[PDB]
Amino acid sequence: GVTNPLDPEEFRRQGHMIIDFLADYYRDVEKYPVRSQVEPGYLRKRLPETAPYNPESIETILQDVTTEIIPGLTHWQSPNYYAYFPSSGSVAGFLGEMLSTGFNVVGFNWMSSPAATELESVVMDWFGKMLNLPESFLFSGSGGGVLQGTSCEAILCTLTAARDRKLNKIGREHIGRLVVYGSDQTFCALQKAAQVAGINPKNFRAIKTFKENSFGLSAATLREVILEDIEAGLIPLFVCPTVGTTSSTAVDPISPICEVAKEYEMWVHVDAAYAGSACICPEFRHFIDGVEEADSFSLNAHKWFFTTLDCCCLWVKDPSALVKALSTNPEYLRVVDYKDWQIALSRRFRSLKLWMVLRSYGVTNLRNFLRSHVKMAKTFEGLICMDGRFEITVPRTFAMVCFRLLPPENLVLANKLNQVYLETVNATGSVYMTHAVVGGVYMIRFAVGSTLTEERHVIYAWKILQEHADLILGKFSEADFSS
Amino acid sequence: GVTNPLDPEEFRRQGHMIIDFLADYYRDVEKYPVRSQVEPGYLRKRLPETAPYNPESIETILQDVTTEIIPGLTHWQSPNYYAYFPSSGSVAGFLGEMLSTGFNVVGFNWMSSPAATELESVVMDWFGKMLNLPESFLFSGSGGGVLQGTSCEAILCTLTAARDRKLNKIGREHIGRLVVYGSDQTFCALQKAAQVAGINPKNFRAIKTFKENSFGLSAATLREVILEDIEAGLIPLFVCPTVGTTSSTAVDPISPICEVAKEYEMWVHVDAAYAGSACICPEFRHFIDGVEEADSFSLNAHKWFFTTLDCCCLWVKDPSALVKALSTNPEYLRNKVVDYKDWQIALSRRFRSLKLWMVLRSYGVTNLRNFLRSHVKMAKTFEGLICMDGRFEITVPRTFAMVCFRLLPPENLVLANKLNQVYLETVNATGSVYMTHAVVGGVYMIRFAVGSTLTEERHVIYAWKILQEHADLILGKFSEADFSS
Numbered sequence A: 001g002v003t004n005p006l007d008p009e010e011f012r013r014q015g016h017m018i019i020d021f022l023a024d025y026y027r028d029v030e031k032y033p034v035r036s037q038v039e040p041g042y043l044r045k046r047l048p049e050t051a052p053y054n055p056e057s058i059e060t061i062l063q064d065v066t067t068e069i070i071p072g073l074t075h076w077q078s079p080n081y082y083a084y085f086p087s088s089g090s091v092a093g094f095l096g097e098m099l100s101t102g103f104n105v106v107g108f109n110w111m112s113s114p115a116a117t118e119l120e121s122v123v124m125d126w127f128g129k130m131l132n133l134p135e136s137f138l139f140s141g142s143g144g145g146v147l148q149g150t151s152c153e154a155i156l157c158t159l160t161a162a163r164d165r166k167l168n169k170i171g172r173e174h175i176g177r178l179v180v181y182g183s184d185q186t187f188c189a190l191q192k193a194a195q196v197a198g199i200n201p202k203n204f205r206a207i208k209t210f211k212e213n214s215f216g217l218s219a220a221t222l223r224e225v226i227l228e229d230i231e232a233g234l235i236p237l238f239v240c241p242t243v244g245t246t247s248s249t250a251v252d253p254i255s256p257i258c259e260v261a262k263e264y265e266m267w268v269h270v271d272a273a274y275a276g277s278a279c280i281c282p283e284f285r286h287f288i289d290g291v292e293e294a295d296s297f298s299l300n301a302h303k304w305f306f307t308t309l310d311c312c313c314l315w316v317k318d319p320s321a322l323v324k325a326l327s328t329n330p331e332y333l334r335v336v337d338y339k340d341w342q343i344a345l346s347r348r349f350r351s352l353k354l355w356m357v358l359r360s361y362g363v364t365n366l367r368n369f370l371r372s373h374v375k376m377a378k379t380f381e382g383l384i385c386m387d388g389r390f391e392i393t394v395p396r397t398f399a400m401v402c403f404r405l406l407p408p409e410n411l412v413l414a415n416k417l418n419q420v421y422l423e424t425v426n427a428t429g430s431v432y433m434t435h436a437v438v439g440g441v442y443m444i445r446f447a448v449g450s451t452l453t454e455e456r457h458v459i460y461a462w463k464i465l466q467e468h469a470d471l472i473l474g475k476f477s478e479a480d481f482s483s
Numbered sequence B: 001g002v003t004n005p006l007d008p009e010e011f012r013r014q015g016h017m018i019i020d021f022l023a024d025y026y027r028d029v030e031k032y033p034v035r036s037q038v039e040p041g042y043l044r045k046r047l048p049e050t051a052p053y054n055p056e057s058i059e060t061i062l063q064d065v066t067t068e069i070i071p072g073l074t075h076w077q078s079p080n081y082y083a084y085f086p087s088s089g090s091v092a093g094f095l096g097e098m099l100s101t102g103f104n105v106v107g108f109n110w111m112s113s114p115a116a117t118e119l120e121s122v123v124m125d126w127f128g129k130m131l132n133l134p135e136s137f138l139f140s141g142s143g144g145g146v147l148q149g150t151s152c153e154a155i156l157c158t159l160t161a162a163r164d165r166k167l168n169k170i171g172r173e174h175i176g177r178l179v180v181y182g183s184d185q186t187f188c189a190l191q192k193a194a195q196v197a198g199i200n201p202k203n204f205r206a207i208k209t210f211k212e213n214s215f216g217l218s219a220a221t222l223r224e225v226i227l228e229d230i231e232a233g234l235i236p237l238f239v240c241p242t243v244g245t246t247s248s249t250a251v252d253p254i255s256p257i258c259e260v261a262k263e264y265e266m267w268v269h270v271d272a273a274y275a276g277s278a279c280i281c282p283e284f285r286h287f288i289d290g291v292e293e294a295d296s297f298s299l300n301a302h303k304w305f306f307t308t309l310d311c312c313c314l315w316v317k318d319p320s321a322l323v324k325a326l327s328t329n330p331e332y333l334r335n336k337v338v339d340y341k342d343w344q345i346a347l348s349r350r351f352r353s354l355k356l357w358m359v360l361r362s363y364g365v366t367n368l369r370n371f372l373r374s375h376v377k378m379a380k381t382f383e384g385l386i387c388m389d390g391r392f393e394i395t396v397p398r399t400f401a402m403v404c405f406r407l408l409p410p411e412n413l414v415l416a417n418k419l420n421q422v423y424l425e426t427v428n429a430t431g432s433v434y435m436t437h438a439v440v441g442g443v444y445m446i447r448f449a450v451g452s453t454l455t456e457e458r459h460v461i462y463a464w465k466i467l468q469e470h471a472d473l474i475l476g477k478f479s480e481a482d483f484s485s
């Protein structure tokens, strides 16, 4: 008669069906154009206007996924995807999320699924020790780690925790004087968190950075601005040094910034969404030096640690600060109750993802995985240096190379050249790279990170970059880009 | 040599294993005690203290999943789970997340994956029309819909959009005078969202409700509280009526509340996290009557619509209000292709539209309506069995497939409350079933929320038998002195 929507046998049948469908995808992903080539509004035309009144077969659905959905995909998993930052996936991360989705438990509290809580605390100490974080950030010591969806939610949590920590001492009425600090290379995650958290929009600070420091935030520039804010009657609150900025993978010196922050009793959050995972390797651990003097530390494991979207790792020194701000139980009362550490009350069993990756691949292989990406970028950097028509614009730090083609006001012309050049490369569908404008210079970002990417794909990307370079420069006229 | 972590053939081999592992789980889930019986800290002792340097096999991990993880699970998907609101799943929903996790794209913007954005706008118009929402909430009309993770996240965005809308008019310095209104039955999503958004803690209102109104918020009482706040120099900002409260599944009258809210220029968010999905059935659509006069509306499709955790559906009349508060573009560019990150907190958006799309297609509106009807029928049957047993009592009117009841003794309330506390915990400890409680109007009452996808009528009858047998046991040896402490 009526089949249960969760029938075990029908679950097994369609389950194996989609597994093969996805294994075929990973096998054939190279045939698709990396950047989707559909036009805006294509999918509403091809789909009905209302939901069907009668059921449709999974076979019919999967066919529409092939003909209607896949064309509208920009293949983050394609081995020739070098845009933005890596959507790092793996087999282990996938299985952990399907076991999480199969169990389908709600981690509202410890009793709703004790394993959904304790396993998270264990793997966060695993991951933290691999990062060689101090004991002040671990359950082993006096700290604590929590898994969240994205970095912006994590930063929003530490921000409100820092906000409540100060306002509870000086009075809630001073919220309009709290100042959030960052560099002009910081992304929305900080400004967006400040907006949601009630910080006054005129009190967000994007401190200028200079080419002389590879656009890392200078603590000296930070102290000047803070003194300007204190003279204006403002209250310094929150500074977010970034290790591996989005634009050029810039690195803010954490230790000098913490020294400035403690003098003014400021919360320090280290934003390592992308590059943080590389600190598992001892030769990269120096990038988060000074994190021992910060209040929180966050990285997106889905950016460069194979878990698949999404899995943000937040380590804090004082979990009570989060609970004091995010819990809804009365203030006086304010086992681990993770729902008081983040925004989400209906937490997902996210620890299985990170638990599978750490066990399936182990520390030794995980270090070399990250090292292989950096080495492929270091090879791409070596190919650029050998072609006199190109230029490395900033120092490579983590597996991403920023470069630009050079022309044979001059900066304005060069920016237009690289914009047109890059767009013709992306329009082929063979590879995909995004750009950035740092210090007024238009530059191309090559972020090696996709799990399927091998050295042949990076060399293949270099050949296309050269062939289009031969194309635009061979017929170059500065009047074609002087508009 | 080392194999690529995303090798297609290894993905195929291990993927089929997990599917068989989960199918076996759904087949045998009844054998586990519903509420986990492990002690706190059991898992830190059974697992190593560091990560392994060398890889471990999927066969080794899966066995550890069986012996270490599953024992520490409270089986929301067990057919004998009637505790908190349902964790509604299905095959179609599971396959949606699997495809979403498989593709593993990031919906940062339209370009990052056009299908990840456009499919969301289409299915939200699908679900909205199923709910008979006015076109002001649809992309066909004036409004739009967005997919988020949880309702508290959706309520936070809706609240900040209401906050910025007001403060942009009168000034940012008045954030300390904005008041957020709810009932004593509203959930902490409203309170938690107020705290994060910068609302002063002393400006959160939990308006008292009464048994005379089944604990639904009275618009007359709301207006009284507003006048006191206005007379005290405060700004009313945001009222959040709830259809299907968490404790007694109470319902607030939307139409008279928006009438009060329109008088004082207040944002109205209709919170229907659990009961919202039931309104695709015409006989239940009356519960969200008056939503035409609210600003936003939210339900949890993972609570009662077979998507899987997580999937929150938020419709708004004015999406630009969300963009103005959540976008990071300068304020003069927000003041003018969908960009869904500007509708929520998360920038790195997940391909959540697949879940909802797979559920709507795989089952259809007709079968989806009947699915919810079967849960309500089973609950109403559970209600009938209780009325036929003179020892039990229905504490509040049942509205959406959840029944509230209590065991009666042969103040009396303190005794009856202690009886049901002992009665309930003795039943839950058996592991045969799991039901949570709530203290509404000073009365301790047991909650029977029928919602687990695998729950059939035989499980409901089985839970009634367990309740009757324990009722015979507790009352058979009853003494006032055993509960008067």
Ligand SMILES: N[C@@H](Cc1ccc(O)cc1)C(=O)O
Residues within 6 Å of the ligand: A084, A085, A086, A087, A088, A187, A246, A302, A303, A309, B106, B108, B347, B348
């Ligand atoms: N938000 C990132 C893009 C990104 C987000 C999430 C990812 O998993 C990967 C890449 C950026 O602007 O660069």
Ligand SMILES: N[C@@H](Cc1ccc(O)cc1)C(=O)O
Residues within 6 Å of the ligand: A106, A108, A345, A346, B084, B085, B086, B087, B088, B246, B300, B302, B303, B304
């Ligand atoms: N917040 C719910 C718990 C819950 C959350 C999500 C669900 O899908 C189900 C139940 C409660 O306290 O009752």
